[PDB]
Paper text:
The omit maps of the ternary complex structures clearly revealed the presence of a bulky, partially defined, electron density within the solvent cavity of most of the OleP monomers in the asymmetric unit of both crystals. Since this density was absent in the omit maps of the corresponding aglycone-bound OleP crystals where the L-rhamnose was not added, we interpreted it as a molecule of the sugar. Due to its flexibility, to the absence of chemical linkage to the aglycone and to the available room in the solvent cavity, L-rhamnose adopts different positions, orientations, and conformations inside each monomer, contacting via hydrogen bonds and van der Waals interactions: (i) OleP residues present in the cavity, (ii) the aglycone moiety bound to the active site at C3-OH and C5-OH, and (iii) solvent molecules. Most contacts established in the crystal structures by L-rhamnose with OleP correspond to the ones observed in silico for the glycosyl moiety of docked L-O-DEO. These contacts include E89 and G92 on the BC loop, and N236, V239, S240, and I243 on the I helix. L-rhamnose in the ternary complex establishes contacts with M178 on the F helix and Q193 on the G helix, which were absent in the docking simulation.
More specifically, OleP catalyzes a regio- and stereospecific reaction of epoxidation at the C8-C8a of the macrolactone ring.
Residue numbers in the entry: 11 to 407
Amino acid sequence: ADAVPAYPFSLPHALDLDPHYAELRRDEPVSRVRLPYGEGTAWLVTRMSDARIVLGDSRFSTAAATDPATPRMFPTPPEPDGVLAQDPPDHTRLRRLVGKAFTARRVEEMRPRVRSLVDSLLDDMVAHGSPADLVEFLAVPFPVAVICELLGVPLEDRDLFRTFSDAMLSSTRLTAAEIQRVQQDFMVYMDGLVAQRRDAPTEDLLGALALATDNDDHLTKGEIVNMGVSLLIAGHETSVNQITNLVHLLLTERKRYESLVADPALVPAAVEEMLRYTPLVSAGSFVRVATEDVELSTVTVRAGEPCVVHFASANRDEEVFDHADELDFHRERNPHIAFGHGAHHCIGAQLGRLELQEALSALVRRFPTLDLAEPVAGLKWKQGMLIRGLERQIVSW
Ligand code: HEM
Ligand SMILES: CC[C@H]1OC(=O)[C@H](C)[C@@H](O)[C@H](C)[C@@H](O)[C@@H](C)C[C@@H](C)C(=O)[C@H](C)[C@@H](O)[C@H]1C
Ligand SMILES: C[C@@H]1O[C@@H](O)[C@H](O)[C@H](O)[C@H]1O
Ligand code: NA
Ligand code: NA
């Protein structure tokens, strides 16, 4: 069965959805693909109802996907101690190590700190004058500062952990051996920061991770340190890219930006809609393997068959969202899965929402004249990574 198409279906263009995803949702919503690594074939799931089953059911296992022969989107076999590769109830125990810092209530308590950080960084951009690179002054330093303060990672390590993090998000830019090397380096660095808390615990998540290493009974050192790596990767890589992505959607059809200048209270709802609209995950997902037969819309997936979701395709499902292909800030309902679903639903969802809200609210309030000040055709979209975003975004005002 080398008659099954390669997935991804193409090198990506900006934030475009391959038009094949809409054809798949209409006519073949569950279809066999060959992923770029591991062996064999995977079902690609393109509709919302099927995505909620694959993401939401104990009969689908991520643990089972750690087999190096399992199809996957990324060069290195999955790390078995990785939070994504855990199944409940062990996954539930692992998430509770840190989950209290990420509840909507605790995240809301960060809004003051977070708005202060944004204000200061836009002051520096103003000091530099127009035009300036929004990536340099906002999209990079803002989420990096927030995740360093929440975990207790020194800000001086920015260049070191951003390099490791970009490598671990490789799709084609690096080989398995280059990434496996970075994984070991990152594991050894994070293990070292957590060890610093041996006779010196801190009031931060690394503090919590170091106590769990000392006192905790069901979780390995590996699982615990790896959680530190996942949070430090996700905690900046998502938001840094999503700020560039959402600003890109706002300035390339400037009525969108103008609608938020007019009404900055629209910003929370605009952030939800642009989370729906944006393929932050360039293609596919961490894989789920059926442990029993499971009925999806058009097929029964057999025990042992792997499945992969395209989150941004589920987020264009025309049986769930009216005019799904259109950016609409006035949707009454937006049941998107930009943050996933089921056990592995994004732990940082509330922190992402907060950072995007405060970054956009500030821009829309203080920079009514904001425009893209480099050509669209020349935009430096990140190539060869599992996520999408801009290396640079020169803006004027
Ligand atoms: C706009 C921001 C974000 C987006 C769009 C986003 C998106 C996602 C998605 C779709 C997943 C599900 C992956 C899957 O099940 O296959 C996920 C999981 C995850 N996200 Fe986020 N995320 C964001 C922000 C964050 C932040 C700020 C953090 C960390 C502070 C974070 C940490 C994670 C982690 C650790 C997981 C894995 C959770 C688990 O396996 O239980 N994310 N994210
Ligand atoms: C195949 C696409 C996915 O990538 C992966 O699985 C990566 C190899 C993970 O190891 C990354 C590096 C982890 O750090 C995650 C915790 C990051 C967090 C933001 C996500 O879960 C993210 C959505 C992720 O699932 C997708 C990018
Ligand atoms: C941060 C993330 O952590 C786990 O999910 C993986 O095993 C891997 O080490 C890394 O990609
Ligand atoms: Na742009
Ligand atoms: Na996988």
